[PDB]
């Protein structure tokens, strides 16, 4: 409907999320969802529906987000979801878990520092994300090649269909540990955005249920349980708890 009472009749929440995000939203060698995000999923699934293994996970694109939540394909998006003004025209956003600023990755042997370091050159972005929505609104010289996936995106990377790569810094920084030939030698292009659960425009039902929920998993210790789980290991004391998540 998706109201709280319609999801309960169901037995089952859908629940958008990313398949190759990690350590936001993956899959693994098993096949079974994991991140940050799906610890959150599983987490309400719990509470809403006596247990976690109530969620359909739906692995969606970052551009797919709003269409699939729009559209009913999914009761909720936790596909590591940035507020913007812009997106909440199209949908309501939840109270937000964490936050996160742009960065930029590009080779160690050619690092990019600047924007005129761009000039007749590539810059790769996933599609439909605020990376691709900052390049395009604030910075129209910069050439943009866009993939709808972010193993795709980097697979670009690594062939060296551009000179570097903007998104998510977390994201940067987690995927650099594991290739280390890169580096993110921009850390941030401006102020940290919240990352927040996103329902269909209308849903308060939904909505003031995520809300509460957020709101006592703040406070009860199951939003600090799934940074440990999924994010410390990554990482480890280089980036504090109080950076990432939210208040
Ligand atoms: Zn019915
Ligand atoms: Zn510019
Ligand atoms: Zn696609
Ligand atoms: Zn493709
Ligand atoms: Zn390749
Ligand atoms: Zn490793």
């Given at each position: ?102 960065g930029?990755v ?63 810094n977390?994201?940067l920084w987690?995927?650099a ?6 580096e993110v030698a921009?850390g ?60």
């Amino acid at each position: 409907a998706a109201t709280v009472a319609a999801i309960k009749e169901k037995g089952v929440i859908r629940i958008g999320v990313f398949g190759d995000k990690p350590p936001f939203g993956y899959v693994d060698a098993n096949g079974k969802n994991q991140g940050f995000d799906v610890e959150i999923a599983k987490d309400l699934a719990k509470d809403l529906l006596g247990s976690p293994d109530k969620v359909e996970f739906v692995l969606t694109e970052a551009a797919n987000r709003v269409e699939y939540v729009r559209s009913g394909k999914v009761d909720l998006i936790l596909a590591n979801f940035t507020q913007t003004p812009e997106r909440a025209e199209a949908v309501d956003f939840a109270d937000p878990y964490m936050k996160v600023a742009l960065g930029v990755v590009s080779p160690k042997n050619k690092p990019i520092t600047d924007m005129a370091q761009l000039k007749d050159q590539t810059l790769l972005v996933n599609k439909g994300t605020t990376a691709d929505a900052f390049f395009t609104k604030s910075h129209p010289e910069v050439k943009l090649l866009k993939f709808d996936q972010n193993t795709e995106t980097f697979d670009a990377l690594k062939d060296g269909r551009g000179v570097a790569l903007a998104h998510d810094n977390a994201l940067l920084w987690a995927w650099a540990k594991e290739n280390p030939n890169f580096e993110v030698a921009i850390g941030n292009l401006g102020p940290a955005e919240f990352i927040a659960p996103a329902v269909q425009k209308g849903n308060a039902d939904l909505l003031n249920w995520v809300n509460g929920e957020i709101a006592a998993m703040k406070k009860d210790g199951r939003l600090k349980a799934a940074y440990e789980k999924t994010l410390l290991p990554v990482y480890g004391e280089k980036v504090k708890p109080e950076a990432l998540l939210a208040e």
